[PDB]
Amino acid sequence: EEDSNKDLAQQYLEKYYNLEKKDSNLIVKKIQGMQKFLGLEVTGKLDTDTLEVMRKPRCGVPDVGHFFPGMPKWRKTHLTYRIVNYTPDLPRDAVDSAIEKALKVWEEVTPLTFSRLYEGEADIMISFAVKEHGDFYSFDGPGHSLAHAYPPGPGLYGDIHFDDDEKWTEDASGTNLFLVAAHELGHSLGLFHSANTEALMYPLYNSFTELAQFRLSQDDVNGIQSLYG
Ligand SMILES: [Ca+2]
Ligand SMILES: [Ca+2]
Ligand SMILES: [Ca+2]
Ligand SMILES: [Ca+2]
Ligand SMILES: [Zn+2]
Ligand SMILES: [Zn+2]
Ligand SMILES: [Zn+2]
Ligand SMILES: [Zn+2]
Quick one: three-class SS letters along 159-227? CEEEECCCCEECCCCCEEHHHHHHHHHHHHHCCCCCCCCCCCCCCECCCCCCHHHCCCCHHHHHHHHHH
| Spatial distance between the Cα atoms of 91 and 88, rounded to a whole number of angstroms | 7
The count of residues in the chain is 229
* CA of 18 relative to ligand 7 center, distance in Å: 28
3-state SS, residue 7? helix
3-state SS, residue 125? strand
| Spatial distance between the Cα atoms of 78 and 200, rounded to a whole number of angstroms | 23
* CA of 23 relative to ligand 3 center, distance in Å: 32
**184 included as an active-site residue:** yes
Fold of 2-55: Muramoyl-pentapeptide Carboxypeptidase; domain 1 (1.10.101)
Q: Give the residue extent of every domain in the chain.
A: 2-55, 78-228
Query: Is the domain covering 78-228 a CATH 3.40.390.10 domain?
Result: yes
User: What method did the depositors use to determine the structure?
Assistant: X-ray
* CA of 208 relative to ligand 1 center, distance in Å: 29
| Residue 193 labelled as part of a binding site | yes
Residues in the 5 Å CB sphere of ion ligand 1:
93
- DSSP state letters, 29-94: HHHHHHHHHHT----SS--HHHHHHHHS-B-SS-SS-----S-SS-S-SEEEEEE----TTS-HHH
Q: 158: how many CB neighbours lie within 10 A of its CB?
A: 27
Angle (CA) 94-95-100 rounded to 5° is: 95
Tell me which DSSP letter residue 124 carries: E
Are 2-55 and 78-228 the same fold in CATH? no
Residues near 77 by Cβ (< 8 Å), separated by ≥ 6? Answer: 111, 112, 113
| Residue 78 labelled as part of a binding site | no
Backbone angle region of 112, left / alpha / beta, with phi > 0 → left and psi within -120 to 50 → alpha: beta
